[PDB]
Design a protein around this ligand. Structure first.
Ligand SMILES: *[C@@H]1O[C@H](CO)[C@@H](O[C@@H]2O[C@H](CO)[C@@H](O)[C@H](O)[C@H]2NC(C)=O)[C@H](O)[C@H]1NC(C)=O
Ligand SMILES: *[C@@H]1O[C@H](CO)[C@@H](O[C@@H]2O[C@H](CO)[C@@H](O)[C@H](O)[C@H]2NC(C)=O)[C@H](O)[C@H]1NC(C)=O
Ligand SMILES: *[C@@H]1O[C@H](CO)[C@@H](O[C@@H]2O[C@H](CO)[C@@H](O)[C@H](O)[C@H]2NC(C)=O)[C@H](O)[C@H]1NC(C)=O
Ligand SMILES: *[C@@H]1O[C@H](CO)[C@@H](O[C@@H]2O[C@H](CO)[C@@H](O)[C@H](O)[C@H]2NC(C)=O)[C@H](O)[C@H]1NC(C)=O
Ligand code: NAG
Ligand code: NAG
Ligand code: NAG
Lengths: 75, 216, 226, 49
């Protein structure tokens, strides 16, 4: 159950087409994770949801509402 | 500069060329080398963190609309070029061309391949041209690039009507200014000195490391 | 509404901190490296460094000084070399913290003591205010930020012709709900009727591109008529 | 490098994502907008001023 990557030989992890958020970094763009019956999968990283913006030369989007969100920063 | 070559050097293979006798003597020194191996690991994982912080600042990957109708401005240079194999813009490649063993020394690969980095810079650049600063705050909001620039003037204290009256003149001044950037990078390599300086120091560092092997 | 959004938002911070320690990773990391470094320091004591025995007294015993000096000298060079490494690690690690402290000072001086217009320097999104909380060997900030949530699509125009004179908004931008033209503030949908008060005239219609015909209501004239 | 990386990190956030009123933090002149471009082991900014 061997998978070949630029990082090296990867043994005991099953390749998958699906991409997800990077979970455990192997390098050269492959991250591995525990997922479903559960096993270890190695996948190409997902850089985030694809989102084209409905741009045009006369269209503007105005927020109509707000959320006060408090975040934590630790140093 | 953002990241440096992620290198890891093995304790023993460098110190002892696979001599058990040499290895046993090394065990007397105790845990020296394992902190060296560990310290170099600390550097290595850190670099993959650097590139995260510089680029992975956008939560979604925006792409520009197909038709490049930007009020006269011309980002064809800096926007990604499909024809080139790596999804890289024209000005990016001028950069990748300008900038240019077996004793336990291994060069680990970076976590973000040069392709994926190019997607962030495509995403960040696509965000700036259609949503201004908004995508940093929250959901990206489409806004005509003519107006967004008119906002930006209003930021520096010049009232808006300066832009809309002089849109044509600004566009050419912006389009031409991009033009000079290509030539300065394409012809003169003194610009990329800093990145080239990072690479040379590291390669020069390893060679001095290997040269030390052959001294009495 | 904002009070409720703020009060609940503080509430979640408890729960995220109450159950998961993944947030506190950064401070815990500093403790481990320093604590782990000392373990390496004391560990080196047991190492022989190529001498007959690691215990110094056993060298003082088990043989007279004139030969024992040679064995001790081998011990010293090993131990002394261990400090050279350990100290040199601290200075470099100490420099890292001090760089982090100076960032904290700037972040404290510029986030809690005042509003900061630097984007993403004090929390994601538009910044309102910040609270410091002390933490073991560190500081924890609560960045209270304003994040615009729900948006709408509106047709917009750079400027408005009224009598052949272009009108530009004093603040905010022109938005049309499809049949009527309004000026609304930049970050919130608060549509309000176009007036000469909202708009300052400049130049002439032809030069601007995308300008749209509409009417600009004038407050004074009905007052004059009535 | 890390000091240089954060300086890029700050410069990315405060200059690309938003207009910055800090003087010469974003190239000489009043700042309008900046563009990021990737580079070998680094990042190159275009500062439109
Ligand atoms: C703006 O967004 C807030 C988000 O909460 C909305 O407030 C909620 O309104 C619903 C009404 O269906 C209430 O049931 C919730 O309790 C409210 N939330 C809170 C936290 O109080 C608000 O209605 C939105 N305003 C507009 C005009 O759409
Ligand atoms: C943006 O500028 C580029 C040039 O950098 C334009 O591309 C050129 O288009 C002309 C036709 O007008 C061609 O003859 C050139 O060969 C093109 N150059 C390249 C490098 O492809 C592009 O048309 C401009 N876009 C707009 C909307 O004006
Ligand atoms: C756009 O907004 C305007 C202003 O609110 C709307 O015009 C009003 O429509 C209501 C009916 O919903 C009438 O009772 C008012 O008399 C109208 N005001 C004026 C000044 O005529 C208009 O209907 C809205 N249209 C859309 C498509 O949103
Ligand atoms: C806005 O309204 C003006 C009229 O106030 C329009 O100007 C007309 O333009 C046409 C086309 O060139 C001419 O044939 C007319 O003679 C113009 N009118 C006058 C009084 O000179 C203008 O076209 C309108 N623009 C838009 C975008 O609706
Ligand atoms: C990925 O998909 C292709 C076809 O789209 C398929 O042939 C291949 O087996 C898939 N990979 C895995 C690991 O199943
Ligand atoms: C604005 O219009 C676009 C058209 O493609 C649509 O995808 C988008 O959802 C609209 N905005 C909202 C808030 O629905
Ligand atoms: C906006 O783009 C449309 C094409 O969709 C074009 O017909 C129109 O003239 C443009 N208007 C402006 C002001 O650029």
């Amino acid at each position: 159950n061997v998978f070949q990557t630029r990082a090296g030989c990867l043994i005991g992890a099953e390749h998958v087409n699906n991409s997800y958020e990077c979970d455990i970094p192997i390098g050269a763009g492959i991250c591995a994770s525990y997922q479903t019956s559960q096993s270890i999968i190695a996948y190409t990283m997902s850089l985030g949801a694809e989102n084209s913006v409905a741009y045009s030369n006369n269209s503007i989007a105005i927020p109509t509402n707000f959320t006060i969100s408090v975040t934590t920063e630790i140093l | 500069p953002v990241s440096m070559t992620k290198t890891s050097v093995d304790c023993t293979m460098y110190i002892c060329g696979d001599s058990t006798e040499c290895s046993n003597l090394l065990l007397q020194y105790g845990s020296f080398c394992t902190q060296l191996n560990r310290a170099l690991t600390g550097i290595a994982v850190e670099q993959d963190k650097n590139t995260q912080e510089v680029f992975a600042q956008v939560k979604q990957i925006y792409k520009t609309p197909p038709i490049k109708d930007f009020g006269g401005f011309n980002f064809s240079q800096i926007l990604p070029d499909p024809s080139k194999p790596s999804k890289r813009s024209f000005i990016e490649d001028l950069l990748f061309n300008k900038v240019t063993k077996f004793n336990g020394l291994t060069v680990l690969p970076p976590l973000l391949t040069d392709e994926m980095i190019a997607q962030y810079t495509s995403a960040l650049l696509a965000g700036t041209i259609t949503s201004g600063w908004t995508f940093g705050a929250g959901a990206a909001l489409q806004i005509p690039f003519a107006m967004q620039m008119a906002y930006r003037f209003n930021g520096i204290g010049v009232t808006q009507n300066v832009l809309y009256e002089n849109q044509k003149l600004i566009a050419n001044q912006f389009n031409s200014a991009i033009g000079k950037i290509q030539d300065s990078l394409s012809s003169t390599a003194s610009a990329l000195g800093k990145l080239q300086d990072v690479v040379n120091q590291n390669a020069q560092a390893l060679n001095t490391l290997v040269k030390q092997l052959s001294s009495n | 509404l904002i009070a409720n959004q703020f009060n609940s938002a503080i509430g979640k911070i408890q729960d995220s901190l109450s159950s998961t320690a993944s947030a506190l990773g950064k401070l815990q990391d500093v403790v481990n490296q320093n604590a782990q470094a000392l373990n390496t320091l004391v560990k080196q004591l047991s190492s022989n460094f190529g001498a007959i025995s690691s215990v110094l007294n056993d060298i003082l015993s088990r043989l007279d000084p004139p030969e024992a000096e040679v064995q001790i000298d081998r011990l010293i060079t090993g131990r002394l070399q261990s400090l050279q490494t350990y100290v040199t690690q601290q200075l470099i690690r100490a420099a890292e913290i001090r760089a982090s402290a100076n960032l904290a000072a700037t972040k404290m001086s510029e986030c809690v003591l005042g509003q900061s217009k630097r984007v993403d320097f004090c929390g994601k999104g538009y910044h309102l205010m910040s609270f410091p909380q002390s933490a073991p060997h560190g500081v924890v900030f609560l960045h209270v930020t304003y994040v615009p949530a729900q948006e709408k699509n509106f047709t917009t125009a750079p400027a408005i012709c009224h009598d052949g004179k272009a009108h530009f908004p004093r603040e905010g931008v022109f938005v049309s709900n499809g049949t009527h033209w309004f000026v609304t503030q930049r970050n919130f949908y608060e549509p309000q009727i176009i007036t000469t008060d909202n708009t300052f005239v400049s130049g002439n219609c032809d030069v601007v591109i995308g300008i749209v015909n509409n009417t600009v209501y004038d407050p004074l004239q009905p007052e004059l008529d009535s």
